[PDB]
Design a protein around this ligand. Structure first.
Ligand SMILES: Cc1cc(Br)c([O-])c(-c2cc3cc(C(N)=[NH2+])ccc3[nH]2)c1
Ligand SMILES: [Ca+2]
Ligand SMILES: [Cl-]
Length: 223
């Protein structure tokens, strides 16, 4: 997260860190046994770390659970990142409480101007890599479709939306992928891609979760 602030320990209880010996992507807890992340974060050997704040120190509240299976969307396209969403089933259920909680799926899509909270342990520099130890937060609005398409002509599908600042300075970045974009208490987006991080006129692009709710429900119900 570039231009963001320290969230404060456990203030984002649905945030998870996907770990393979180091933090590589974020994710969101949607129920005690399932996490939603991005398809491009897929790899085998994923350990899901819940209740984290400093990812390099065990401070208490952490629950480390291995992924039992990861389900990448069948129509995921790695070249366009269209359908960039993945579900991870946990080997055992997590204990939910005030420090570890799930986030609700949306019932409707959000409109441009909606202010959302994006969080993650991704890079904090737009020119260089500085990865943080604690969770960072950024409040960002969803942009209109014309501004998004004018910024990325021909690369935005109906399963994506842009959120951020065209002046540059505040944005999500590598390491934040797979993480949550929460608006009015509902998970509306998944950090997916962008051109560089926090560059002017190049906002972040997110997977539009309202388009996958029946897919998530049907897939969870059959697995
Ligand atoms: C080299 C590399 C590898 C992975 Br995996 C990423 O997710 C990314 C990445 C860049 C990137 C940029 C943004 C943004 N909002 N500007 C968001 C997610 C991103 N993810 C980059
Ligand atoms: Ca920790
Ligand atoms: Cl276009």
């Amino acid at each position: 997260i570039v231009g963001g602030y320290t969230c404060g320990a456990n203030t984002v209880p649905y945030q998870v860190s996907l770990n393979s010996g180091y933090h590589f992507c974020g994710g969101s807890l949607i129920n005690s046994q399932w996490v939603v992340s991005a398809a491009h974060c897929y790899k085998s050997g994923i350990q899901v770390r819940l209740g984290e704040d400093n990812i390099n120190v065990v401070e208490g509240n952490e629950q480390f659970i291995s992924a039992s299976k990861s389900i990448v969307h069948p129509s995921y396209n790695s070249n366009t990142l269209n359908n960039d969403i993945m579900l991870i089933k946990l080997k055992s259920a997590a204990s939910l409480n005030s420090r570890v909680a799930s986030i609700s799926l949306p019932t409707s899509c959000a409109s441009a101007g909606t202010q959302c909270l994006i969080s993650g342990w991704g890079n904090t520099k737009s020119s260089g890599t500085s990865y943080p130890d604690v969770l960072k937060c950024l409040k960002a609005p969803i942009l209109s479709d014309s501004s998004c398409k004018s910024a990325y002509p021909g690369q935005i599908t109906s399963n994506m939306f842009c959120a951020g600042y065209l002046e540059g300075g505040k944005d999500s970045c590598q390491g934040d992928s797979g993480g949550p974009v929460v608006c009015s208490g509902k998970l509306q987006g998944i950090v997916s891609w962008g051109s560089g991080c926090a560059q002017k006129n190049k906002p972040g692009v997110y997977t539009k979760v309202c388009n996958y709710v029946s897919w998530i429900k049907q897939t969870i119900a059959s697995n």
